[PDB]
Amino acid sequence: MSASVTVLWDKEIEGSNEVVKVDEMVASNIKVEFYLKERHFDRTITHNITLPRATEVPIGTEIQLEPKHRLNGNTEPITFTYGSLESYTELSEDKVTMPEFVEPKTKLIVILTRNENITSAPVEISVGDIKETATYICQSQSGINAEVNTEP
């Protein structure tokens, strides 16, 4: 009930790829400190395994794989179970330092962005004499960048 697993990373597909504006914070001066010292965000990577509708892989088969994109320095494999656990989400805290002050005669804008990417790859599975090519999907978020612009 434990499959042999090989991900075909050289066949990876670049799905959605975007730079997402998470938020903006604006302030104006005439030298006050900023609202927050740091902002805290949730950052996730979601790992999914998908199988053909008509697959021979038995329900309950365990499928262990090691993704490319991980959080928290985690390195242990993800264990999916076909028919009951097909998605796993990593979560980390992304802490972003804010500008300390608004300099004199300044309007300050913080633009917060991160990369968000979907990638997918074939997964060759064998359990006994049953062979299948499943599809692995990674929905990842990068760390957040803060761009501080000073205006009139």
Question: Domain boundaries in the chain?
Answer: 4-151
What would you measure as the largest C-alpha separation in the chain, in angstroms? Answer: 75
Architecture per CATH, domain 4-151, reads as Beta Complex (2.170)
Buried b (16+ CB within 10 A) or exposed e, 111-142: ebbbebbbbbbbbebebeeeebebebbbbbbb
Per-residue tokens: 14: 């670049």
Measured between its terminal Cα atoms, the distance across the chain in Å is: 66
Name the experimental technique: X-ray
* Resolution of the structure in the document, Å: 1.7
